[PDB]
Structures are given as structure tokens and as C-alpha cells.
Swiss-Prot record:
Name of the protein this chain belongs to: Signal recognition particle receptor FtsY
UniProt note: domains: Contains an acidic N-terminal A domain, a central N domain and a C-terminal GTPase G domain that can bind and hydrolyze GTP. Contains at least two lipid-binding sites. The first site contains the first 14 amino acids (helix 1) and the second binding site is an amphipathic alpha-helix located at the interface between the A- and the N-domain (helix 2).
Chain's role: Involved in targeting and insertion of nascent membrane proteins into the cytoplasmic membrane. Acts as a receptor for the complex formed by the signal recognition particle (SRP) and the ribosome-nascent chain (RNC). Interaction with SRP-RNC leads to the transfer of the RNC complex to the Sec translocase for insertion into the membrane, the hydrolysis of GTP by both Ffh and FtsY, and the dissociation of the SRP-FtsY complex into the individual components.
Superkingdom in the source lineage: Bacteria
GO molecular function: ATP hydrolysis activity; GTP binding; GTPase activity; protein homodimerization activity; signal recognition particle binding
Modifications after synthesis and translation: Proteolytically cleaved. The cleavage may regulate function and subcellular location of FtsY. Full-length FtsY is found primarily associated with the membrane, while cleaved protein is predominantly present in the cytoplasm.
GO CC annotations on file: cytoplasmic side of plasma membrane; cytosol; plasma membrane
Annotated gene: ftsY
Species this chain originates from: Escherichia coli (strain K12)
Bilayer disposition of the protein: Peripheral membrane protein
Length: 295
């Protein structure tokens, strides 16, 4: 599958580690190491190991090979807890606030997401709320134009929340089903980001007390621990309702999906396993685990 690189250490990769081995602390240490190198993280790895030890003992397993099935079980539960799909229907418009750092995929994810919704029969409108990042504003505009998707964009530096308020206002008038709004992502000024996003979320209430219907964080799987810290940061700034993991193909640090799931508990909406529009796959825990573990 596309997850071929993460499989060296996770899922299928466990088999080679367990081959012929007996169950002792030496083995759990070897596994712990593999999990940490895979970016599962200290806390999640400590949790996985203990659960697995209690399980391998209270079922009297002396054979290491059998841990593959028990790993599949506990890691499956971790992803299952954040397996709630994004349902963007019944609103006018359904506002998705896209938060996250620059160069993490946001603008690209926005384009892919818009194409997917339109492919389902719903009109989309974009809002360039990252008003200072002139490259990103430009990108959404030219792209939206050639895709016949209205893009609400204003002068460089205009108040983000105003652009988005105008975008929501316009969306309601033009009967748009989904409005996807971009935001500025500069962690360099922690509390400014918090106050900025807080203003955005508040100004929205003037036109709809339900907006935003979705606060989506986009993070890059290939940046391992960076993806986790970023999530923690945005988790404390805004009310994240969904997360999107991009660039899962091509990185052996794929275990980060378990770290971001276990530590925050926020629904993983989409998983990026390639560069095509269909590659921004709606996240299904069971399908992911099955492919992670498939020999």
C-alpha cells in the first residue's frame, strides 16, 4: 500500500521483531524502542507497553509472535476513539475554519477538500483569511478562478475576521453549502494567534451562532514530533473539532497518528496518503489498522 515506509517498524514490521523470540522485559524494551523511533511518543508508548504486558501475562503468552494480534487490538482502539467522520451537510453554509502552520499543506488541503465536496454535489466558497501570506491568497484565488469556485479575498493585511465575515455573508447570499476559511498560522507569537483566532470565532457568531461548524487543524506527518507540538499548541488556542494528517506516504514516522490520537482525542477527519485529490482519504480506523498490519 502507500504506507510501505511506516511498515518497517509498525504493523507488519512487528512480525520480524517478534520472530522466534520469547516474552521477557528484553523483548518489551526492544518493542518500546521501535515504537519511539516510529514516533508513537513517550506517553502513548508507555500506555501501549503496559496494556500489552498485562495482556500477554494474563493469557499466559510465552510466545512473542502472538503480540502482533494484541498490538493490532490496542493500537486499533486508540485510532477507533477518533474515528468520527466529517459530515458537512444541512448548513448554509457549513463553515470550516482551517488552522495550522505555513507549509504544512493547508492551502493544498483546502483545494483538495473543495474538489471533494463539489464532487459530491455541493457548492463551495473559499475565504483567504491568511491575509498577510500573499502567496497563499494568490494561490487560492487563481486556483479558485480556474475551478469556478468563488474565493473571497481582500487587500494584504485586511483583518482576517472581517474577510471571513464577508465570506460568510456572501456564502449565505449565493447559497453556498460549504465555506472553507484559511487562517494565519504563526506560532512565533503564541497568544497573538490565540487572540486572533478567538476574534475570528467570535465575529462569526454575528451571522450564525453555530459557526464555525468545524475547526480543522492540518498537520504534516513527516515532521513527526513537530506535528504533535503544533497540535498541542492549537489545542490550547482554539476548540479543535477535527484533524487532518497529510504526507503519510513516504515517511517511516507514521506512528505519529497514534500520538496525535491518544494525546488529544480530537477526531482525525482526513488522512493524506498521496498527492491525488482522492488521496486525501476520509479517515477510517479499521481500514488504516488493517493496512498497517497487513503482511
Amino acid at each position: 500500500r502507500s504506507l510501505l515506509k511506516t511498515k518497517e517498524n509498525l504493523g507488519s514490521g512487528f512480525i520480524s521483531l517478534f520472530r522466534g523470540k520469547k516474552i521477557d522485559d528484553d523483548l518489551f524494551e526492544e518493542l518500546e524502542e521501535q515504537l519511539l523511533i516510529a514516533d508513537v511518543g513517550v506517553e502513548t508508548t508507555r500506555k501501549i507497553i503496559t496494556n500489552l504486558t498485562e495482556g500477554a501475562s494474563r493469557k499466559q503468552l510465552r510466545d512473542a509472535e502472538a503480540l502482533y494480534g494484541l498490538l493490532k487490538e490496542e493500537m486499533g482502539e486508540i485510532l477507533a476513539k477518533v474515528d468520527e467522520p466529517l459530515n458537512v451537510e444541512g448548513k448554509a453554509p457549513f463553515v470550516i475554519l482551517m488552522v495550522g502552520v505555513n507549509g504544512v499543506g493547508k492551502t493544498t488541503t483546502i483545494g483538495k477538500l473543495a474538489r471533494q465536496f463539489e464532487q459530491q454535489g455541493k457548492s463551495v466558497m473559499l475565504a483567504a483569511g491568511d491575509t498577510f501570506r500573499a502567496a497563499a491568497v494568490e494561490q487560492l484565488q487563481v486556483w479558485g478562478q480556474r475551478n469556478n469556485i468563488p474565493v473571497i479575498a481582500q487587500h494584504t493585511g485586511a483583518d482576517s475576521a472581517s474577510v471571513i465575515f464577508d465570506a460568510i455573508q456572501a456564502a449565505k447570499a449565493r447559497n453556498i453549502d460549504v465555506l472553507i476559511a484559511d487562517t494565519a498560522g504563526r506560532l512565533q507569537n503564541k497568544s497573538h494567534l490565540m487572540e486572533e483566532l478567538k476574534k475570528i470565532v467570535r465575529v462569526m457568531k454575528k451571522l450564525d451562532v453555530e459557526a464555525p461548524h468545524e475547526v480543522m487543524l492540518t498537520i504534516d506527518a513527516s515532521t513527526g514530533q513537530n506535528a504533535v507540538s503544533q497540535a498541542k499548541l492549537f489545542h490550547e488556542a482554539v476548540g479543535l473539532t477535527g484533524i487532518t494528517l497529510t504526507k503519510l506516504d513516504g515517511t517511516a514516522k507514521g506512528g505519529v497518528i497514534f500520538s496525535v490520537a491518544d494525546q488529544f482525542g480530537i477526531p482525525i477527519r482526513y488522512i493524506g496518503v498521496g498527492e491525488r485529490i482522492e488521496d486525501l482519504r476520509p479517515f477510517k480506523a479499521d481500514d488504516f489498522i488493517e493496512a498497517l498490519f497487513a503482511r
